[PDB]
Write a protein that binds this ligand. Structure first.
Ligand SMILES: Nc1ncnc2c1ncn2[C@@H]1O[C@H](COP(=O)(O)OP(=O)(O)NP(=O)(O)O)[C@@H](O)[C@H]1O
Ligand SMILES: [Mg+2]
Ligand SMILES: [Mg+2]
Ligand SMILES: [Mg+2]
Ligand SMILES: [Mg+2]
Lengths: 927, 157, 158
């Protein structure tokens, strides 16, 4: 930046700039650096392939660039590109080492070759190509290289471990520990764990060789293998260390020719195969699985079916999996899972293959249920099958019947009682089927009497399921249970009151906030049900306290501290209470895995804060304080606005980020959005949570413009804009952006002078802003002025806090907000050098692809806007525009555009200066 | 190829006097074709086969029967018809102006469009090319179907 | 057909039946013969891949079946599956020929290997790996093979 970069100093600056990204752990800026201002050589366009899933297209390009013999570094580029992609057998078989049999003399750059060629020879256990290799190493004179000698000592340890000599290989592994403990190891508390991990995988592969060598018999060797398989659980789930450690156990078990070592070796090949086919790298899963056929395992017939399924060919995988299914009409072949899971996989990717009609799949779904009925993954599968087939008929001209939701609910509710680990993403799909046919049985009930018979007993399914399912699992649809109470059904209204009774008996203190806001409205129907839900609560047995009356004492106080507009220090002894705090670190649910308690431990209200605060906006809402059970100052914000809209934004957020934490296109990049528990109290009022350590970027830019002594105005600023015509907007915008230089790239310096925290903070900034940058636009957020882009000092996340207008309401006002989202020249170079063509664009594409893949669930979550605000037609147009924005239809000339296309459209209309000149100086764009 | 080019057009009436074979090279032609648009189901003891696949013809395809060149060329035919839905429907639009104003011609054209795109005629939703091939073959050679139809289209031959 | 085929005579009938399709030019019956009444061995399910667009998935399966050193014909199956898919540079770089630098002695089935290894060396123009190759050919005594000598003469012409 301090260089004038427009000149030609970007030749010598870049050939080491890519070095400072290609081992930093970050890729999406490296791929962004390569495709911007570096487009001269075609080899630069070739090296982008080896990070973007077409790496083997770049491998064999490098192999024939590697047979030019002109430069030594274009050979080690090929070797490092092989080693980064685990082509170990291809490294040791390279002709760059084998002149005829041996290798060349003392090594200026050849040692960097040998460092690879040793290491792959350690990972391919073959005593001859490992033994002549160190025969060629020990002809050298003075091995200066710090890196060669580690893999050398591991190699001679493996050669001694093949010669059945325990103390000798202990000696050489202790030499390897000495070399790592002096030379390779560096300081902690400065570097990450990401760069230390490359050495920790080698240490974990050094310990298990000493742990498997120290064994004189199979009696302890089996125990050693179980201890190492226990050590394969702390390892995590990344492919590189998993494959490395399993490759070293592979290299152990085929140098030691014990028969128990070979029985271990078949297990290691099968685990390498099923490891690699789950990591989308079936190039080596096949050539590891084929070792299990010379051992002839009876489990490789299914593993090759999964490799065929991941390859792409569907019908041959179906043929082999049904071949081993009718092989399970033979003898025992344990009846519990090894038959039922094979038939379940057959049905699941018979569904996915689209190679059958429905009843052919159902006739063996019931066969799965016959052969095993105490295991709910088949019930999950058939619930997903019906709750997919309902849309795949509904895409055509299919209308409301009841049987395809009857069977769906009848298998979902039977599913939930067993393992309850798929409740977050399926039970909202359940109880929207519970209250669609129920309303259709009220709309035009006099044939479509079938759904009237279907709604007669799905209510019976809910009643019969509630008595022997867990209680907490209804909390996930709690606001959807808080809405749709006025359903005009009179048979599911009693059940949706019963579902709040049952949720109030066990675990009251969380939902008592919602149940006290429930007996509060202007329309006197929610309150009328609020007595009924609270008449019968104290009628139930466990009434430990007067916490209902004290709960209303909190509630009416908190809804009367929003009327008192001052332009006071009321009741205080309501705290302490067994009522628990409204912070989002009270009200979530812990992730259901397979006895746990469904909450974080209780951090209740203790001392209500006294000194409040009101903010400097036009419409002025007010901030309170809470002292919790730990004594932390928990902030609380009370607004005189309907935050019932703001809760559904937040439930969209909490069904969005838990999908973001499941996609490997996002968990590799660690996406996420901020979140805070917002609750309604009554209409045109509400409470919401205060994320700590935050700052508005008005406050960031106010203290940096004045630090440069740049003189500007706030009242004289926008009247000049008001007095400009339609033509002067562009020149006014260009003069204002030449006034203020972009300065947000050094506020990240001033927060994190530790540069590793700065780098991780800028990546976290770009990614976390990138997701919500069109999660808001798809919801039509707008109103994104500089007092509402809140950044946290701790790590650099981005949160959006105002969000009063959604569903593109910001276009329905004079000088309308016609940006998709606030992308603004302070924020662009804050994303980095390359700007928007970097982690921002890639994480945007991942976000949009994940929202297109989950259209039905996200639209199903946002359906509750239509019953929060009931009967508008503009809400219908808003939901249709929302559906088209999710699927990716451009709002002008409407037809479906790609994820990269929609990303480029929204970015090149967000940073467009002709747009950024137009909008109102409340949303002041030139900042 | 014509085994479901006729079925997609709803050919029927495929009795043994209308499966003409040439002595020169062994092609197959269909010559009667008076009824199209699945009209053969609108008569008593209706023709409920997709096409005449009949146990003289099965082992005539070879040892492996229908699981061979027949199935693969069927899949290639159905995939090429799905890839060219718009042009083939555009060619067959002229039925609607040869015979002008029927409503059964509209139902016939909609069933024709669903047969081209690959929708199974019971529980209607989109099925794959290998799926539609296996469906039409395992309902053509099904003996419970082949017992039913009239001895004009005599199936046991 | 004249055999009652329901019995177990379909073991000795098939291992030459696939031979009578895999060079006849027809594939869709060969792929139809393999997936019907022949579903015992998994290697039979592997060899269906090399005719149905996933041939390189079967190549590297054959390469690690080809490093078992148990049978000579499971090596020439790998070599013919390479040659049918034009992997000439991968044929001449095979370790089944290069013991260290040279090759093995007089050839019962190894000549079927050399017939491939000459021919790919003709198709990869590289004078050193073509010159030491016919240096190894001319150490032999009596090359009986009708197929070797064509590619040999093309090699010495090159
Ligand atoms: N969750 C939160 N975390 C931190 N600060 C918050 C949060 N919610 C609101 N704020 C603060 O509240 C300010 C504005 O609150 P807001 O909800 O926008 O009320 P408002 O009157 O609508 N403001 P505005 O619409 O811009 O006139 C922001 O600038 C933040 O400082
Ligand atoms: Mg605001
Ligand atoms: Mg506001
Ligand atoms: Mg006729
Ligand atoms: Mg006729």
């Amino acid at each position: 930046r301090q260089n004038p970069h427009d000149k030609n100093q970007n030749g010598q600056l870049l050939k080491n700039l890519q070095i400072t990204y290609e081992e930093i752990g970050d890729i999406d800026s490296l791929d962004g650096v390569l495709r911007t201002f570096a487009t001269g050589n075609l080899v630069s366009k070739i090296e982008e392939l080896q990070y973007s899933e077409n790496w083997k297209l770049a491998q064999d390009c490098f192999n024939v660039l590697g047979k030019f013999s002109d430069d030594p570094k274009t050979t080690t580029r090929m070797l490092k590109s092989m080693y980064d992609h685990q082509l170990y057998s291809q490294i040791i078989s390279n002709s760059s080492f084998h002149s005829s049999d041996g290798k060349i003399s003392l090594s200026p750059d050849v040692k960097e070759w040998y460092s690879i060629g040793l290491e792959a020879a350690n990972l391919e256990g073959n005593v001859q190509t490992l033994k002549n290799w160190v025969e060629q190493i020990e002809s050298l004179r003075n091995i200066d290289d710090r890196e060669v000698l580690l893999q050398y000592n591991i190699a001679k340890a493996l050669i001694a471990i093949s010669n059945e000599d325990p103390l000798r290989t202990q000696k050489y592994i202790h030499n390897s520990f000495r070399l790592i403990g002096t030379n390779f190891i560096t300081s902690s508390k400065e570097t990450t764990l990401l760069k230390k991990q490359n050495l920790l995988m080698k240490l974990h592969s050094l310990y298990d060789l000493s742990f498997l060598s120290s064994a004189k018999d199979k009696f302890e060797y089996k125990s050693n293998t179980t201890i190492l398989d226990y050590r394969m659980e702390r390892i995590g789930a990344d492919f590189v260390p998993n494959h490395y450690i399993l490759s070293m156990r592979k290299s152990f078990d085929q140098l030691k020719m014990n028969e128990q070592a070979d029985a271990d070796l078949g297990k290691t090949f099968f685990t390498l195969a099923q490891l690699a086919r789950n990591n989308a790298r079936l190039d080596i899963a096949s050539e590891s699985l084929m070792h299990c056929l010379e051992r002839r395992l009876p489990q490789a017939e299914l593993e090759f079916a999964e490799i065929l399924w991941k390859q792409g060919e569907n019908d041959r995988a179906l043929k082999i999996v049904q071949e081993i299914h009718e092989k399970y009409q033979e003898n025992s072949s344990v009846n519990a899972r090894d038959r039922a899971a094979v038939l379940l996989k057959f049905t699941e990717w018979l569904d996915l293959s689209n190679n059958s009609a429905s009843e052919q799949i159902i006739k063996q779904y019931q066969d799965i249920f016959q052969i095993d009925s105490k295991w709910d993954k088949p019930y999950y599968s058939i619930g997903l099958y019906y709750s997919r087939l309902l849309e795949r008929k509904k895409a055509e001209g299919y209308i409301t019947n009841g049987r395809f939701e009857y069977r769906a609910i009848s298998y979902f509710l039977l599913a939930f009682e067993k393992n309850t680990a798929k409740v977050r993403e399926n039970l909202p799909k359940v109880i929207t089927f519970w209250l669609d046919i129920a309303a259709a049985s009220i709309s035009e009930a006099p044939r479509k009497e079938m759904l009237s018979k279907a709604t007669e007993d799905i209510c019976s399914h809910v009643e019969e399921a509630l008595q022997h399912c867990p209680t907490y699992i209804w909390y996930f649809v709690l606001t959807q249970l808080l809405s749709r109470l006025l359903h005009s059904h009179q048979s599911s209204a009693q059940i949706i009151m019963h579902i709040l009774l049952s949720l109030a008996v066990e675990y009251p203190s969380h939902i008592l906030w919602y149940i006290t806001a429930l007996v509060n409205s202007n329309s006197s129907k929610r309150v009328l049900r609020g007595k009924h839900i609270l008449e019968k609560y104290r009628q139930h047995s466990q009434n430990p306290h007067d916490l209902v009356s004290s709960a209303l004492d909190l509630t009416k106080a908190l809804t009367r501290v929003c009327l008192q507009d001052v332009k006071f220090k009321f009741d205080m002894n309501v705290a302490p209470s067994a009522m628990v705090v409204p912070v989002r670190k009270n009200l979530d649910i812990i992730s259901p895995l397979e006895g746990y308690q469904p909450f974080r431990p209780v951090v209740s209200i203790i001392r209500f804060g006294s000194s409040y605060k009101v903010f400097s906006s036009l419409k002025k809402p007010k901030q309170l304080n809470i002292i919790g059970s730990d004594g932390n100052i928990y902030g609380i914000m009370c607004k005189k606005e309907d935050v019932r809209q703001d809760n559904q934004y937040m439930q969209f957020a909490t069904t969005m980020d838990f999908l973001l934490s499941k996609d490997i296109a996002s968990r590799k990049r660690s996406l996420g959005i901020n979140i805070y528990s917002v609750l309604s109290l009554r209409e045109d009022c509400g409470i919401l949570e205060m994320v700590p350590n935050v700052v508005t970027l008005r406050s960031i830019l106010s203290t940096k413009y004045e630090s440069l002594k740049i003189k500007y105005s706030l009242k004289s600023l926008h009247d000049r804009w008001q007095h400009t015509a339609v033509d002067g907007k562009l020149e006014f915008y260009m003069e204002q952006v030449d006034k203020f230089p972009p300065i947000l790239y050094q506020w990240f310096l001033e927060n994190f002078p530790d540069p590793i925290n700065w780098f991780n903070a800028r990546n976290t900034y770009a990614r976390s802003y990138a997701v919500m940058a069109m999660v808001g636009h798809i919801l039509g957020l707008g109103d994104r002025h500089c007092e509402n882009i809140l950044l946290d000092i701790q790590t650099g996340k981005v949160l959006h806090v105002d969000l009063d207008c959604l569903f593109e309401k910001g276009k329905r006002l004079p000088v309308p907000e016609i940006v998709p989202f606030r992308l603004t020249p302070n924020l662009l170079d804050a994303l980095g050098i390359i700007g928007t063509e970097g982690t921002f664009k890639k994480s945007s594409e991942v976000t949009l692809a994940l929202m297109r893949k989950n259209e039905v669930a996200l639209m199903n979550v946002i359906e509750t806007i239509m019953y929060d605000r009931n009967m508008d037609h503009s809400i219908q147009k808003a939901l249709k525009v929302l559906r088209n924005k999710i699927r990716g239809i451009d709002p002008q000339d409407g037809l479906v555009l790609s994820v990269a296309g929609q990303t480029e459209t929204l970015i090149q209309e967000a940073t467009s200066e002709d747009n950024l000149s137009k909008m109102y100086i409340g949303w002041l764009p030139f900042w």
